[PDB]
Structures are given as C-alpha cells and as structure tokens.
C-alpha cells in the first residue's frame, strides 16, 4: 500500500441506467483497481434527491437537477481503494462531458453536463457525507475472501 | 416483441465478487438485451443462504454450498427481458464450468461447479420464488425513461 484506502460514492445516473451502461461503468471501476463494497438500484423520490443535493436547494439549476435525478432508476454504490476519491474522478473524467478526456465515463456515455452519466464524490469529506446519506454502515460489505 | 417478457434472478457469487468481475458479468447481461431492474450487494447470513436453498437442506452438498455462499459478499439482481430465464442461462453457460461453452460466464470466470461464479434461475416458476425471496415487489425498479 502506498496511498490511503478511501471510500467514495458512485451513482450511475438515470441516463446511463436507461441506456444499459451499468456493467460497462462498473467494469471500469474494477479495471482501475477499485472494489465495489456496496451497491443498490433505487428510484429516488423527490425528497431523496432534494436531500442529497440540499447544499444547492436555492440554486437555479436545482429544480432541473432534481427532476433529472428522479426521472428513472439509478444505481448507488460505494467504491473502495487506494486514493479512491481521486482515482474515481480520473475514471469519470471532467464533470462536463464536453471537457472530459477521451476514454473517460463522461466522454463515452454522455454529451452534456446536465445529464452526465455518473456521479462521483468530490472529496474525502463529501464522500463520507454522501455514503452516509445512502448507506447504513452495516450495509457496506467488506471483502472477506 | 416476439417472446414474453420475463424476470429472472441473478447472483454474482462470492468468488466472482472477490475477483472483481461484477462489471464484466453485468455488461454481458446488458449486451444480451437484458435490463437490470433491481440489484443489491449483500453478505448472506447462514440463515439467508439456507432459506434460499431450502429445497436441498437434506442433501450432502448443502453444507458446503451454504458455507461457500456465505464466505463473502454477493450481488443479487433481477434481470428483465424477452425470454429472460433462458436467455440468461445461455449467457451463463452450463452450471458445470467444465461443460460450459466458450465465451459464457461459467467458462470465463470459474473452473468448478462448487464455485461457479454466478447463479441464474432455472425456470420461470423458480424465478418467481427466487426473486420474491430477495426482493419486495416495490423494490424492483421499472424503466421509466
């Protein structure tokens, strides 16, 4: 081990779920050495989505964001690995798919920032909050084999 | 539509989870036209596994099966699509990896029948039972987009 093991939140957003890219996206996580240690498919209620993005409730984009993130089922996951927060963001690419590097999830599975295929926690601090929002601690499944 | 839409249970077993093949296996489901309409990662308790395989509780292989299926986390999913029960079994390949056709999940991710990477429901009838074992009806997430 050379970097601290971290946990970060992934969401496969309703666009990428609807286009059946869950496996492709998961496979990218695993290829990069991250471990999926929790996952569940959910259709977010309005309150679920509003609570997750509560920091931004007064922002102009909030309504559309909440509508999109409740428009179809998502997959929420916890990814574990060395340097996971930044490693995940590297795989994801830039938040804006138009700026995302070739071969990244945003570049390959999205075209615009409003529907950009996947979420990743921005920081170690925000990951702790985001994971706790969707998962009980005892829901997370450490590897035992 | 030319065949009835069916739902079937998938389990990515503790071996394939431990070797980080969840994405690869999911991607195969989606490539074959199946939709993941529910999924969750779980570490089965002894009672969970014994209840799922209750038909076989008096069989000689039962103890080892239960030990294996509780040895690490699994991913349980519901797959939906035309002819899904048999379509899933075609992707999985023979239950015995030594008999499984090249390019199937059992052939590619397993070597022996006791730890054979993945479960698929045997029939429409057993799928109904198996899905109901792990999922509430309202847990399943129909596509809305």
PDB file of C-alpha atoms in Angstrom:
ATOM      1  CA  UNK A   1       0.000   0.000   0.000  1.00  0.00           C
ATOM      2  CA  UNK A   2       1.292   3.463  -0.924  1.00  0.00           C
ATOM      3  CA  UNK A   3      -1.780   5.675  -0.590  1.00  0.00           C
ATOM      4  CA  UNK A   4      -4.561   5.675   1.997  1.00  0.00           C
ATOM      5  CA  UNK A   5      -7.526   3.424   1.295  1.00  0.00           C
ATOM      6  CA  UNK A   6     -10.602   5.567   0.738  1.00  0.00           C
ATOM      7  CA  UNK A   7     -14.304   5.064   0.096  1.00  0.00           C
ATOM      8  CA  UNK A   8     -16.244   7.155  -2.387  1.00  0.00           C
ATOM      9  CA  UNK A   9     -19.828   7.333  -3.656  1.00  0.00           C
ATOM     10  CA  UNK A  10     -20.759   6.402  -7.199  1.00  0.00           C
ATOM     11  CA  UNK A  11     -24.140   6.999  -8.784  1.00  0.00           C
ATOM     12  CA  UNK A  12     -24.965   5.631 -12.212  1.00  0.00           C
ATOM     13  CA  UNK A  13     -27.471   8.302 -13.211  1.00  0.00           C
ATOM     14  CA  UNK A  14     -30.869   7.732 -14.857  1.00  0.00           C
ATOM     15  CA  UNK A  15     -29.492   8.352 -18.348  1.00  0.00           C
ATOM     16  CA  UNK A  16     -26.761   5.689 -18.127  1.00  0.00           C
ATOM     17  CA  UNK A  17     -29.123   3.231 -16.424  1.00  0.00           C
ATOM     18  CA  UNK A  18     -31.732   3.765 -19.151  1.00  0.00           C
ATOM     19  CA  UNK A  19     -29.114   3.054 -21.837  1.00  0.00           C
ATOM     20  CA  UNK A  20     -27.916  -0.110 -20.051  1.00  0.00           C
ATOM     21  CA  UNK A  21     -24.365   1.021 -19.279  1.00  0.00           C
ATOM     22  CA  UNK A  22     -24.253  -0.175 -15.667  1.00  0.00           C
ATOM     23  CA  UNK A  23     -21.951  -3.106 -16.427  1.00  0.00           C
ATOM     24  CA  UNK A  24     -19.596  -1.109 -18.639  1.00  0.00           C
ATOM     25  CA  UNK A  25     -19.269   1.571 -15.974  1.00  0.00           C
ATOM     26  CA  UNK A  26     -18.795  -0.924 -13.109  1.00  0.00           C
ATOM     27  CA  UNK A  27     -16.189  -2.749 -15.191  1.00  0.00           C
ATOM     28  CA  UNK A  28     -14.226   0.461 -15.468  1.00  0.00           C
ATOM     29  CA  UNK A  29     -14.211   0.876 -11.718  1.00  0.00           C
ATOM     30  CA  UNK A  30     -12.946  -2.674 -11.231  1.00  0.00           C
ATOM     31  CA  UNK A  31     -10.346  -2.442 -14.012  1.00  0.00           C
ATOM     32  CA  UNK A  32      -8.889   0.583 -12.219  1.00  0.00           C
ATOM     33  CA  UNK A  33      -8.475  -1.419  -9.022  1.00  0.00           C
ATOM     34  CA  UNK A  34     -11.492  -0.126  -7.114  1.00  0.00           C
ATOM     35  CA  UNK A  35     -13.694  -2.588  -5.226  1.00  0.00           C
ATOM     36  CA  UNK A  36     -17.470  -2.352  -5.182  1.00  0.00           C
ATOM     37  CA  UNK A  37     -18.263  -2.806  -1.486  1.00  0.00           C
ATOM     38  CA  UNK A  38     -21.899  -1.707  -1.567  1.00  0.00           C
ATOM     39  CA  UNK A  39     -24.454  -1.194  -4.322  1.00  0.00           C
ATOM     40  CA  UNK A  40     -28.193  -0.884  -4.803  1.00  0.00           C
ATOM     41  CA  UNK A  41     -30.601   0.163  -7.526  1.00  0.00           C
ATOM     42  CA  UNK A  42     -33.156   2.714  -6.408  1.00  0.00           C
ATOM     43  CA  UNK A  43     -35.724   5.057  -7.914  1.00  0.00           C
ATOM     44  CA  UNK A  44     -35.171   8.286  -5.969  1.00  0.00           C
ATOM     45  CA  UNK A  45     -38.177  10.173  -4.655  1.00  0.00           C
ATOM     46  CA  UNK A  46     -38.224  13.958  -4.936  1.00  0.00           C
ATOM     47  CA  UNK A  47     -37.348  14.159  -1.241  1.00  0.00           C
ATOM     48  CA  UNK A  48     -34.477  11.669  -1.705  1.00  0.00           C
ATOM     49  CA  UNK A  49     -32.893  13.746  -4.453  1.00  0.00           C
ATOM     50  CA  UNK A  50     -33.541  17.088  -2.749  1.00  0.00           C
ATOM     51  CA  UNK A  51     -31.920  15.796   0.431  1.00  0.00           C
ATOM     52  CA  UNK A  52     -28.837  14.527  -1.392  1.00  0.00           C
ATOM     53  CA  UNK A  53     -28.293  17.891  -3.097  1.00  0.00           C
ATOM     54  CA  UNK A  54     -29.536  20.027  -0.171  1.00  0.00           C
ATOM     55  CA  UNK A  55     -26.494  22.316  -0.308  1.00  0.00           C
ATOM     56  CA  UNK A  56     -27.821  23.615  -3.622  1.00  0.00           C
ATOM     57  CA  UNK A  57     -31.534  23.979  -2.851  1.00  0.00           C
ATOM     58  CA  UNK A  58     -31.576  27.725  -3.575  1.00  0.00           C
ATOM     59  CA  UNK A  59     -29.653  27.450  -6.850  1.00  0.00           C
ATOM     60  CA  UNK A  60     -31.254  27.996 -10.253  1.00  0.00           C
ATOM     61  CA  UNK A  61     -30.236  24.558 -11.537  1.00  0.00           C
ATOM     62  CA  UNK A  62     -31.682  22.706  -8.523  1.00  0.00           C
ATOM     63  CA  UNK A  63     -35.158  22.023  -9.911  1.00  0.00           C
ATOM     64  CA  UNK A  64     -33.930  20.560 -13.194  1.00  0.00           C
ATOM     65  CA  UNK A  65     -31.249  18.529 -11.394  1.00  0.00           C
ATOM     66  CA  UNK A  66     -33.820  17.032  -9.045  1.00  0.00           C
ATOM     67  CA  UNK A  67     -36.213  16.298 -11.930  1.00  0.00           C
ATOM     68  CA  UNK A  68     -33.459  14.527 -13.883  1.00  0.00           C
ATOM     69  CA  UNK A  69     -32.184  12.534 -10.913  1.00  0.00           C
ATOM     70  CA  UNK A  70     -35.737  11.285 -10.207  1.00  0.00           C
ATOM     71  CA  UNK A  71     -36.684  10.645 -13.855  1.00  0.00           C
ATOM     72  CA  UNK A  72     -35.676   6.967 -13.751  1.00  0.00           C
ATOM     73  CA  UNK A  73     -33.827   4.465 -11.540  1.00  0.00           C
ATOM     74  CA  UNK A  74     -30.213   4.982 -10.501  1.00  0.00           C
ATOM     75  CA  UNK A  75     -27.545   2.712  -9.057  1.00  0.00           C
ATOM     76  CA  UNK A  76     -25.813   3.987  -5.921  1.00  0.00           C
ATOM     77  CA  UNK A  77     -22.526   2.325  -4.919  1.00  0.00           C
ATOM     78  CA  UNK A  78     -19.601   2.571  -2.556  1.00  0.00           C
ATOM     79  CA  UNK A  79     -16.179   2.138  -4.178  1.00  0.00           C
ATOM     80  CA  UNK A  80     -13.139   1.291  -2.057  1.00  0.00           C
ATOM     81  CA  UNK A  81      -9.472   1.501  -2.900  1.00  0.00           C
ATOM     82  CA  UNK A  82      -6.202   3.340  -2.576  1.00  0.00           C
ATOM     83  CA  UNK A  83      -6.747   7.011  -3.419  1.00  0.00           C
ATOM     84  CA  UNK A  84     -10.323   6.084  -4.369  1.00  0.00           C
ATOM     85  CA  UNK A  85     -11.839   9.577  -4.404  1.00  0.00           C
ATOM     86  CA  UNK A  86      -9.397  10.949  -6.975  1.00  0.00           C
ATOM     87  CA  UNK A  87      -8.941   7.616  -8.772  1.00  0.00           C
ATOM     88  CA  UNK A  88     -12.700   7.503  -9.318  1.00  0.00           C
ATOM     89  CA  UNK A  89     -12.734  11.073 -10.606  1.00  0.00           C
ATOM     90  CA  UNK A  90      -9.956  10.207 -13.091  1.00  0.00           C
ATOM     91  CA  UNK A  91     -12.050   7.326 -14.487  1.00  0.00           C
ATOM     92  CA  UNK A  92     -15.144   9.551 -14.581  1.00  0.00           C
ATOM     93  CA  UNK A  93     -13.436  12.392 -16.379  1.00  0.00           C
ATOM     94  CA  UNK A  94     -14.442  16.042 -16.159  1.00  0.00           C
ATOM     95  CA  UNK A  95     -17.924  16.740 -14.830  1.00  0.00           C
ATOM     96  CA  UNK A  96     -18.682  18.467 -18.132  1.00  0.00           C
ATOM     97  CA  UNK A  97     -18.610  15.745 -20.837  1.00  0.00           C
ATOM     98  CA  UNK A  98     -17.528  18.353 -23.406  1.00  0.00           C
ATOM     99  CA  UNK A  99     -14.323  18.843 -21.384  1.00  0.00           C
ATOM    100  CA  UNK A 100     -13.847  15.180 -20.471  1.00  0.00           C
ATOM    101  CA  UNK A 101     -10.764  13.342 -21.714  1.00  0.00           C
ATOM    102  CA  UNK A 102     -11.167  10.547 -24.266  1.00  0.00           C
ATOM    103  CA  UNK A 103     -11.812   7.157 -22.685  1.00  0.00           C
ATOM    104  CA  UNK A 104     -13.487   8.531 -19.558  1.00  0.00           C
ATOM    105  CA  UNK A 105     -17.021   7.675 -18.446  1.00  0.00           C
ATOM    106  CA  UNK A 106     -18.366  11.196 -19.100  1.00  0.00           C
ATOM    107  CA  UNK A 107     -16.770  11.322 -22.565  1.00  0.00           C
ATOM    108  CA  UNK A 108     -18.043   7.893 -23.575  1.00  0.00           C
ATOM    109  CA  UNK A 109     -21.553   7.829 -22.097  1.00  0.00           C
ATOM    110  CA  UNK A 110     -22.725  11.462 -22.044  1.00  0.00           C
ATOM    111  CA  UNK A 111     -22.812  14.661 -24.123  1.00  0.00           C
ATOM    112  CA  UNK A 112     -23.881  17.425 -21.699  1.00  0.00           C
ATOM    113  CA  UNK A 113     -23.275  18.375 -18.058  1.00  0.00           C
ATOM    114  CA  UNK A 114     -26.975  18.327 -17.090  1.00  0.00           C
ATOM    115  CA  UNK A 115     -27.163  14.598 -17.839  1.00  0.00           C
ATOM    116  CA  UNK A 116     -23.622  13.372 -17.414  1.00  0.00           C
ATOM    117  CA  UNK A 117     -23.976   9.578 -16.863  1.00  0.00           C
ATOM    118  CA  UNK A 118     -22.472   9.319 -13.395  1.00  0.00           C
ATOM    119  CA  UNK A 119     -21.747  10.982 -10.061  1.00  0.00           C
ATOM    120  CA  UNK A 120     -18.572  10.750  -8.021  1.00  0.00           C
ATOM    121  CA  UNK A 121     -17.859  12.323  -4.635  1.00  0.00           C
ATOM    122  CA  UNK A 122     -15.758  15.469  -4.952  1.00  0.00           C
ATOM    123  CA  UNK A 123     -13.623  14.947  -1.841  1.00  0.00           C
ATOM    124  CA  UNK A 124     -12.915  12.612   1.071  1.00  0.00           C
ATOM    125  CA  UNK A 125     -15.138  14.831   3.247  1.00  0.00           C
ATOM    126  CA  UNK A 126     -18.055  14.905   0.828  1.00  0.00           C
ATOM    127  CA  UNK A 127     -17.701  11.145   0.249  1.00  0.00           C
ATOM    128  CA  UNK A 128     -18.227  10.492   3.962  1.00  0.00           C
ATOM    129  CA  UNK A 129     -21.442  12.547   3.868  1.00  0.00           C
ATOM    130  CA  UNK A 130     -22.709  11.100   0.601  1.00  0.00           C
ATOM    131  CA  UNK A 131     -22.077   7.483   1.555  1.00  0.00           C
ATOM    132  CA  UNK A 132     -23.787   8.011   4.920  1.00  0.00           C
ATOM    133  CA  UNK A 133     -26.775   9.548   3.136  1.00  0.00           C
ATOM    134  CA  UNK A 134     -27.495   6.379   1.161  1.00  0.00           C
ATOM    135  CA  UNK A 135     -25.988   3.579   3.304  1.00  0.00           C
ATOM    136  CA  UNK A 136     -26.035   2.379   6.875  1.00  0.00           C
ATOM    137  CA  UNK A 137     -22.511   1.468   7.971  1.00  0.00           C
ATOM    138  CA  UNK A 138     -23.591  -2.153   8.370  1.00  0.00           C
ATOM    139  CA  UNK A 139     -24.858  -2.128   4.761  1.00  0.00           C
ATOM    140  CA  UNK A 140     -21.333  -1.869   3.426  1.00  0.00           C
ATOM    141  CA  UNK A 141     -19.768  -5.267   2.737  1.00  0.00           C
ATOM    142  CA  UNK A 142     -16.041  -5.630   3.362  1.00  0.00           C
ATOM    143  CA  UNK A 143     -14.237  -8.274   1.376  1.00  0.00           C
ATOM    144  CA  UNK A 144     -13.698 -11.438   3.425  1.00  0.00           C
ATOM    145  CA  UNK A 145     -12.281 -13.879   0.859  1.00  0.00           C
TER     146      UNK A 145
ATOM    147  CA  UNK B   1     -41.913  -8.164 -29.126  1.00  0.00           C
ATOM    148  CA  UNK B   2     -41.825 -11.838 -30.129  1.00  0.00           C
ATOM    149  CA  UNK B   3     -41.362 -13.650 -26.821  1.00  0.00           C
ATOM    150  CA  UNK B   4     -42.883 -12.992 -23.403  1.00  0.00           C
ATOM    151  CA  UNK B   5     -41.021 -10.571 -21.161  1.00  0.00           C
ATOM    152  CA  UNK B   6     -39.712 -12.444 -18.136  1.00  0.00           C
ATOM    153  CA  UNK B   7     -37.846 -11.659 -14.932  1.00  0.00           C
ATOM    154  CA  UNK B   8     -35.095 -13.874 -13.581  1.00  0.00           C
ATOM    155  CA  UNK B   9     -32.749 -13.863 -10.584  1.00  0.00           C
ATOM    156  CA  UNK B  10     -29.019 -13.361 -10.947  1.00  0.00           C
ATOM    157  CA  UNK B  11     -26.487 -13.827  -8.179  1.00  0.00           C
ATOM    158  CA  UNK B  12     -22.856 -12.890  -8.668  1.00  0.00           C
ATOM    159  CA  UNK B  13     -21.372 -15.404  -6.240  1.00  0.00           C
ATOM    160  CA  UNK B  14     -18.656 -14.729  -3.643  1.00  0.00           C
ATOM    161  CA  UNK B  15     -15.891 -15.984  -5.934  1.00  0.00           C
ATOM    162  CA  UNK B  16     -16.718 -13.613  -8.814  1.00  0.00           C
ATOM    163  CA  UNK B  17     -17.291 -10.705  -6.419  1.00  0.00           C
ATOM    164  CA  UNK B  18     -13.931 -11.354  -4.741  1.00  0.00           C
ATOM    165  CA  UNK B  19     -12.192 -11.311  -8.138  1.00  0.00           C
ATOM    166  CA  UNK B  20     -13.935  -8.063  -9.163  1.00  0.00           C
ATOM    167  CA  UNK B  21     -15.938  -9.431 -12.095  1.00  0.00           C
ATOM    168  CA  UNK B  22     -19.244  -7.746 -11.248  1.00  0.00           C
ATOM    169  CA  UNK B  23     -18.981  -5.209 -14.069  1.00  0.00           C
ATOM    170  CA  UNK B  24     -17.880  -7.735 -16.682  1.00  0.00           C
ATOM    171  CA  UNK B  25     -20.767 -10.023 -15.774  1.00  0.00           C
ATOM    172  CA  UNK B  26     -23.355  -7.203 -15.686  1.00  0.00           C
ATOM    173  CA  UNK B  27     -22.065  -5.976 -19.045  1.00  0.00           C
ATOM    174  CA  UNK B  28     -22.777  -9.377 -20.513  1.00  0.00           C
ATOM    175  CA  UNK B  29     -26.348  -9.248 -19.300  1.00  0.00           C
ATOM    176  CA  UNK B  30     -26.853  -5.813 -20.848  1.00  0.00           C
ATOM    177  CA  UNK B  31     -25.115  -6.710 -24.122  1.00  0.00           C
ATOM    178  CA  UNK B  32     -27.587  -9.580 -24.497  1.00  0.00           C
ATOM    179  CA  UNK B  33     -30.520  -7.193 -24.179  1.00  0.00           C
ATOM    180  CA  UNK B  34     -31.459  -7.879 -20.565  1.00  0.00           C
ATOM    181  CA  UNK B  35     -32.258  -4.957 -18.263  1.00  0.00           C
ATOM    182  CA  UNK B  36     -31.088  -4.793 -14.668  1.00  0.00           C
ATOM    183  CA  UNK B  37     -34.253  -3.733 -12.838  1.00  0.00           C
ATOM    184  CA  UNK B  38     -33.100  -4.451  -9.289  1.00  0.00           C
ATOM    185  CA  UNK B  39     -29.730  -5.089  -7.674  1.00  0.00           C
ATOM    186  CA  UNK B  40     -28.087  -5.077  -4.266  1.00  0.00           C
ATOM    187  CA  UNK B  41     -24.850  -6.252  -2.701  1.00  0.00           C
ATOM    188  CA  UNK B  42     -25.326  -8.338   0.413  1.00  0.00           C
ATOM    189  CA  UNK B  43     -23.314 -10.597   2.694  1.00  0.00           C
ATOM    190  CA  UNK B  44     -25.654 -13.551   3.245  1.00  0.00           C
ATOM    191  CA  UNK B  45     -26.100 -14.909   6.749  1.00  0.00           C
ATOM    192  CA  UNK B  46     -26.211 -18.670   7.252  1.00  0.00           C
ATOM    193  CA  UNK B  47     -29.989 -18.427   7.607  1.00  0.00           C
ATOM    194  CA  UNK B  48     -30.235 -16.338   4.408  1.00  0.00           C
ATOM    195  CA  UNK B  49     -28.387 -18.942   2.364  1.00  0.00           C
ATOM    196  CA  UNK B  50     -30.120 -21.919   3.983  1.00  0.00           C
ATOM    197  CA  UNK B  51     -33.504 -20.357   3.265  1.00  0.00           C
ATOM    198  CA  UNK B  52     -32.670 -19.688  -0.381  1.00  0.00           C
ATOM    199  CA  UNK B  53     -31.592 -23.300  -0.938  1.00  0.00           C
ATOM    200  CA  UNK B  54     -34.155 -24.853   1.447  1.00  0.00           C
ATOM    201  CA  UNK B  55     -35.257 -27.440  -1.123  1.00  0.00           C
ATOM    202  CA  UNK B  56     -31.844 -29.058  -0.721  1.00  0.00           C
ATOM    203  CA  UNK B  57     -31.391 -28.922   3.059  1.00  0.00           C
ATOM    204  CA  UNK B  58     -31.084 -32.709   3.412  1.00  0.00           C
ATOM    205  CA  UNK B  59     -28.609 -33.108   0.547  1.00  0.00           C
ATOM    206  CA  UNK B  60     -24.944 -33.971   1.069  1.00  0.00           C
ATOM    207  CA  UNK B  61     -23.716 -30.877  -0.782  1.00  0.00           C
ATOM    208  CA  UNK B  62     -25.884 -28.471   1.249  1.00  0.00           C
ATOM    209  CA  UNK B  63     -23.372 -27.640   3.983  1.00  0.00           C
ATOM    210  CA  UNK B  64     -20.539 -26.800   1.597  1.00  0.00           C
ATOM    211  CA  UNK B  65     -22.898 -24.818  -0.654  1.00  0.00           C
ATOM    212  CA  UNK B  66     -24.109 -22.742   2.277  1.00  0.00           C
ATOM    213  CA  UNK B  67     -20.541 -22.187   3.521  1.00  0.00           C
ATOM    214  CA  UNK B  68     -19.424 -21.010   0.071  1.00  0.00           C
ATOM    215  CA  UNK B  69     -22.426 -18.752  -0.488  1.00  0.00           C
ATOM    216  CA  UNK B  70     -21.797 -17.055   2.889  1.00  0.00           C
ATOM    217  CA  UNK B  71     -17.995 -16.852   2.550  1.00  0.00           C
ATOM    218  CA  UNK B  72     -18.044 -13.321   1.106  1.00  0.00           C
ATOM    219  CA  UNK B  73     -20.467 -10.731  -0.302  1.00  0.00           C
ATOM    220  CA  UNK B  74     -22.679 -11.463  -3.298  1.00  0.00           C
ATOM    221  CA  UNK B  75     -24.674  -9.296  -5.682  1.00  0.00           C
ATOM    222  CA  UNK B  76     -28.318 -10.278  -6.149  1.00  0.00           C
ATOM    223  CA  UNK B  77     -30.163  -8.837  -9.164  1.00  0.00           C
ATOM    224  CA  UNK B  78     -33.365  -9.041 -11.140  1.00  0.00           C
ATOM    225  CA  UNK B  79     -32.916  -9.201 -14.922  1.00  0.00           C
ATOM    226  CA  UNK B  80     -35.816  -8.376 -17.239  1.00  0.00           C
ATOM    227  CA  UNK B  81     -36.245  -9.082 -20.916  1.00  0.00           C
ATOM    228  CA  UNK B  82     -37.809 -11.182 -23.622  1.00  0.00           C
ATOM    229  CA  UNK B  83     -37.217 -14.860 -22.844  1.00  0.00           C
ATOM    230  CA  UNK B  84     -35.060 -13.716 -19.914  1.00  0.00           C
ATOM    231  CA  UNK B  85     -34.890 -17.002 -17.998  1.00  0.00           C
ATOM    232  CA  UNK B  86     -33.417 -18.975 -20.895  1.00  0.00           C
ATOM    233  CA  UNK B  87     -31.534 -16.000 -22.363  1.00  0.00           C
ATOM    234  CA  UNK B  88     -29.780 -15.580 -19.018  1.00  0.00           C
ATOM    235  CA  UNK B  89     -28.927 -19.276 -18.873  1.00  0.00           C
ATOM    236  CA  UNK B  90     -27.412 -19.068 -22.381  1.00  0.00           C
ATOM    237  CA  UNK B  91     -25.119 -16.217 -21.263  1.00  0.00           C
ATOM    238  CA  UNK B  92     -24.248 -18.102 -18.066  1.00  0.00           C
ATOM    239  CA  UNK B  93     -23.410 -21.332 -19.821  1.00  0.00           C
ATOM    240  CA  UNK B  94     -23.664 -24.790 -18.282  1.00  0.00           C
ATOM    241  CA  UNK B  95     -23.845 -24.926 -14.497  1.00  0.00           C
ATOM    242  CA  UNK B  96     -20.674 -27.023 -14.565  1.00  0.00           C
ATOM    243  CA  UNK B  97     -17.876 -24.741 -15.867  1.00  0.00           C
ATOM    244  CA  UNK B  98     -16.085 -27.788 -17.307  1.00  0.00           C
ATOM    245  CA  UNK B  99     -19.084 -28.310 -19.618  1.00  0.00           C
ATOM    246  CA  UNK B 100     -19.720 -24.623 -20.308  1.00  0.00           C
ATOM    247  CA  UNK B 101     -19.372 -23.311 -23.855  1.00  0.00           C
ATOM    248  CA  UNK B 102     -16.554 -20.886 -24.674  1.00  0.00           C
ATOM    249  CA  UNK B 103     -17.479 -17.256 -24.064  1.00  0.00           C
ATOM    250  CA  UNK B 104     -20.009 -17.985 -21.319  1.00  0.00           C
ATOM    251  CA  UNK B 105     -19.809 -16.618 -17.777  1.00  0.00           C
ATOM    252  CA  UNK B 106     -19.118 -20.038 -16.209  1.00  0.00           C
ATOM    253  CA  UNK B 107     -16.398 -20.826 -18.770  1.00  0.00           C
ATOM    254  CA  UNK B 108     -14.679 -17.465 -18.382  1.00  0.00           C
ATOM    255  CA  UNK B 109     -14.913 -16.827 -14.634  1.00  0.00           C
ATOM    256  CA  UNK B 110     -14.954 -20.275 -12.993  1.00  0.00           C
ATOM    257  CA  UNK B 111     -13.303 -23.714 -13.099  1.00  0.00           C
ATOM    258  CA  UNK B 112     -15.515 -25.975 -10.942  1.00  0.00           C
ATOM    259  CA  UNK B 113     -19.231 -26.448 -10.241  1.00  0.00           C
ATOM    260  CA  UNK B 114     -18.925 -25.880  -6.471  1.00  0.00           C
ATOM    261  CA  UNK B 115     -17.775 -22.298  -7.065  1.00  0.00           C
ATOM    262  CA  UNK B 116     -19.207 -21.395 -10.435  1.00  0.00           C
ATOM    263  CA  UNK B 117     -19.217 -17.546 -10.477  1.00  0.00           C
ATOM    264  CA  UNK B 118     -22.941 -16.947 -10.847  1.00  0.00           C
ATOM    265  CA  UNK B 119     -26.480 -18.178 -10.250  1.00  0.00           C
ATOM    266  CA  UNK B 120     -29.411 -17.983 -12.631  1.00  0.00           C
ATOM    267  CA  UNK B 121     -32.988 -19.117 -12.020  1.00  0.00           C
ATOM    268  CA  UNK B 122     -33.701 -22.477 -13.639  1.00  0.00           C
ATOM    269  CA  UNK B 123     -37.268 -21.734 -14.752  1.00  0.00           C
ATOM    270  CA  UNK B 124     -39.994 -19.091 -14.846  1.00  0.00           C
ATOM    271  CA  UNK B 125     -41.541 -20.732 -11.761  1.00  0.00           C
ATOM    272  CA  UNK B 126     -38.321 -20.852  -9.763  1.00  0.00           C
ATOM    273  CA  UNK B 127     -37.505 -17.271 -10.817  1.00  0.00           C
ATOM    274  CA  UNK B 128     -40.754 -16.040  -9.261  1.00  0.00           C
ATOM    275  CA  UNK B 129     -39.826 -17.744  -5.975  1.00  0.00           C
ATOM    276  CA  UNK B 130     -36.194 -16.660  -6.010  1.00  0.00           C
ATOM    277  CA  UNK B 131     -36.923 -13.028  -6.828  1.00  0.00           C
ATOM    278  CA  UNK B 132     -39.579 -12.887  -4.097  1.00  0.00           C
ATOM    279  CA  UNK B 133     -37.084 -14.349  -1.625  1.00  0.00           C
ATOM    280  CA  UNK B 134     -34.667 -11.440  -2.020  1.00  0.00           C
ATOM    281  CA  UNK B 135     -36.883  -8.530  -3.171  1.00  0.00           C
ATOM    282  CA  UNK B 136     -40.099  -6.831  -2.188  1.00  0.00           C
ATOM    283  CA  UNK B 137     -42.188  -6.140  -5.288  1.00  0.00           C
ATOM    284  CA  UNK B 138     -41.835  -2.407  -4.671  1.00  0.00           C
ATOM    285  CA  UNK B 139     -38.033  -2.820  -4.600  1.00  0.00           C
ATOM    286  CA  UNK B 140     -37.959  -3.631  -8.290  1.00  0.00           C
ATOM    287  CA  UNK B 141     -37.474  -0.547 -10.464  1.00  0.00           C
ATOM    288  CA  UNK B 142     -39.243  -0.485 -13.822  1.00  0.00           C
ATOM    289  CA  UNK B 143     -37.695   1.646 -16.516  1.00  0.00           C
ATOM    290  CA  UNK B 144     -39.469   4.999 -16.840  1.00  0.00           C
ATOM    291  CA  UNK B 145     -37.271   6.886 -19.321  1.00  0.00           C
TER     292      UNK B 145
END
